[PDB]
Structure 1
Amino acid sequence: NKILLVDDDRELTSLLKELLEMEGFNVIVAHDGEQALDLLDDSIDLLLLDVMMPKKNGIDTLKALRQTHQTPVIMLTARGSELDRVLGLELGADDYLPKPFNDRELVARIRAILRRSHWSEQKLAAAL
């Protein structure tokens, strides 16, 4: 399972890349929305998307990717108000996890949406 980490905080992306790699994931990192959309392809199983970033913020990245991709996305951002959360979810995100977060909850939410993805694939392969 391949995760695209989109966050402009290099310290967090390095910590998360190591964590998710320890958890058995293939991780690719984008540092803005522009980079993200350039790296986004069919091989990506999930996006961990930050909101406030230079060049193209996460809200605009999500709006753009959702025009062509149904790829699962989890917003992982310091923007944690009820408004921020409802906006992310309504714009196309499958989950929304504010910062600061617990690593165990992040992994559990990654696994929750990837379990749903696998069930969808199994049902599709069963029907085919």
Structure 2
Amino acid sequence: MDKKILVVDDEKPIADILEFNLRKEGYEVHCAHDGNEAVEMVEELQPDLILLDIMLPNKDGVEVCREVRKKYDMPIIMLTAKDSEIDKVIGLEIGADDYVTKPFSTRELLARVKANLRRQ
């Protein structure tokens, strides 16, 4: 039973590199490119962790996080820019469990995903 990860990002390039490296590490990965699709997939897939771009189609990252939390407790990691402090802080305030700044190394990505899947 491979851990299931939902990558929610509209930047095909970054989204695809996340999928490449996670599958390579042995995760079962699914991708969503907009909020609605994500919330949809979340229910009929129930991923063990969601990687969520905070800047989806208009603040949707925060809104996606809020909706999902209205019914699910799985770890959510926000993907944010390096130069905005508020983008990093806001997610943890509304239900997300962690954040990772771009650009990020594969080493950081995998460590963050595993640490969050195994959080006490």
Fold shared per TM-score above 0.5: yes
Aligned-residue CA RMSD (Å): 1.7
- Following TM superposition, by how much is the alpha carbon of 1:43 offset from its aligned partner in structure 2, in angstroms? 3.3
Q: Which structure 1 segments of 5+ residues have no match?
A: 121-128
TM-score, normalization: structure 1?
0.84
User: In the aligned structure 2, how far is the partner of 1:75 from the partner of 1:44?
Assistant: 15
C-alpha displacement of 1:56? 6.6
Superposition pairs of residues 1-128 of structure 1, within 5 angstroms = 1-41=3-43, 43-54=46-57, 57-78=60-81, 80-116=83-119
How far apart are residue 58 of structure 1 and its match? 0.5
How far apart, CA to CA, are the structure 2 residues paired with 1:72 and 1:96? Answer: 11
Structure of greater Rg: 1
Aligned length in residues: 117
Report percent identity of matched pairs.
48
The 8 Å contact of residues 9 and 53 in structure 2, kept in 1 or not, is answered as yes
Flag the structure with higher helix content: 1
TM-score under structure 2 length normalisation? 0.89
Amino acid in structure 2 at the alignment position of 1:81:
S
